Amino acid sequence: VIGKILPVEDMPFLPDGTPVDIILNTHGVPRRMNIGQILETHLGWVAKAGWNIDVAAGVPDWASKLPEELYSAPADSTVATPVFDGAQEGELAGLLGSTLPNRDGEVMVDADGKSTLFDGRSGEPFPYPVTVGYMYILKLHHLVDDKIHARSTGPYSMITQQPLGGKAQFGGQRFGEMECWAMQAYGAAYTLQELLTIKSDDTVGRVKVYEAIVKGENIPEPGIPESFKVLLKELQSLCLNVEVLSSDGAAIEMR
């Protein structure tokens, strides 16, 4: 996910003044076990930064098994590397060792494939050279226009008396069992009992709490959840007489 969009200037930038577009976290790589992106990155620098390799009078070792006439390449040279018969390990060590004076008469990236970056934010140089390069990145469909969703109140379902699901109907967000488990593990009876009554079900509850909030009064104590009425009526529909007794005295209806 895009954690932060930095203003152009506060961005680790090359000695020629080009700000890098993205910074991917290093700790990810050895854990996730996908170094590919780094070789892809490296070769990228070789792809953008054109390379007239001063081959040699007797050819360099890395270019002993050099592919079809791939010794010179102009600026922004688009390269093909198949997924097994592709660019080898040590080849890239030869391919980065390649002169490309980007307007100014100096190389940016070193033999190893790292570059000395100036911090846009701080203003200092980074104390060690960091692995810059060109990477092909993909705009993914998992978008905030799909994912982001909010609801203070809104339009409720007719069948159930708890807020709907989905951004289209302006729904709520699902408070599951596992959340109740955690609420109870905290021991936050009031939060859970607020979530499972006025925030979802109780028709008097929601309007009364909205009214009480907009008036700026004490939140009314949630009394009669719709779920319990539903289950009481539903159990009484299957010919089971269920009556809630007090500690001492006579029994009551909920209303």
Site for other proteins in 202-221 (CB under 8 A): 202, 209, 213-214, 216-219
Phi (first) and psi of residue 40, to 5 degrees: -50, -50
Among 111, 188, 207, 252, binds other proteins (CB under 8 A): 188
Q: Which of 14, 9, 24 is nearest to 118 (CA)?
A: 14
Among 75, 160, 181, 236, binds other proteins (CB under 8 A): 181
Which class for 164: exposed (0-12), middle (13-18), buried (19 or more C-beta within 10 A)? middle
1 or 159: CB nearest other proteins = 1
Q: Output the CA torsion sign for 100, 105, 110, 111.
A: positive
Q: Please identify which residue in the block is written with the tokens 């040699």.
A: 56
User: Is residue 117 involved in binding other proteins (CB under 8 A)?
Assistant: yes
Among 12, 94, 97, 163, binds other proteins (CB under 8 A): 12
Instruction: List the Cα angle 117/118/120 in 5-degree steps.
Output: 125
* Residue 178 contacts residue 192 (beta carbons within 8 Å): no
Binding mask 141-160 for other proteins (x = CB under 8 A): xx-x--xx---x--------
57 or 245: CB nearest other proteins = 245
Rg (C-alpha) for the chain, rounded Å, is 32
Q: What is the C-alpha to C-alpha distance for residues 112 and 94, in angstroms, rounded to an integer?
A: 9
Q: What is the C-alpha to C-alpha distance for residues 120 and 12, in angstroms, rounded to an integer?
A: 5
* Residue 163 contacts residue 154 (beta carbons within 8 Å): yes
Q: List residues bridging with 13 in a β-sheet.
A: 19, 118
Among 19, 81, 93, 208, binds other proteins (CB under 8 A): 19
Tell me how far, at minimum, the Cβ of 36 lies from other proteins, in Å. 13
59 or 207: CB nearest other proteins = 207
Given the rule CB under 8 A, which of 58-66, 81-89, 127-135, 154-162 is the region that contacts other proteins? 127-135
63 or 195: CB nearest other proteins = 195
Among 134, 164, 170, 204, binds other proteins (CB under 8 A): 134
Given the rule CB under 8 A, which of 50-58, 82-90, 158-166, 167-175 is the region that contacts other proteins? 167-175
Among 29, 70, 93, 164, binds other proteins (CB under 8 A): 29
In this structure, which amino acid lies at residue 223?
A: G
Among 74, 82, 90, 123, binds other proteins (CB under 8 A): 123
Given the rule CB under 8 A, which of 50-58, 60-68, 156-164, 174-182 is the region that contacts other proteins? 174-182
Instruction: Determine the size of the site formed for other proteins (CB under 8 A).
Output: 111
Residues in the chain preceding a C-to-N separation beyond 2.5 angstroms (breaks): none
In this structure, which amino acid lies at residue 107?
A: V
Among 55, 59, 75, 189, binds other proteins (CB under 8 A): 189
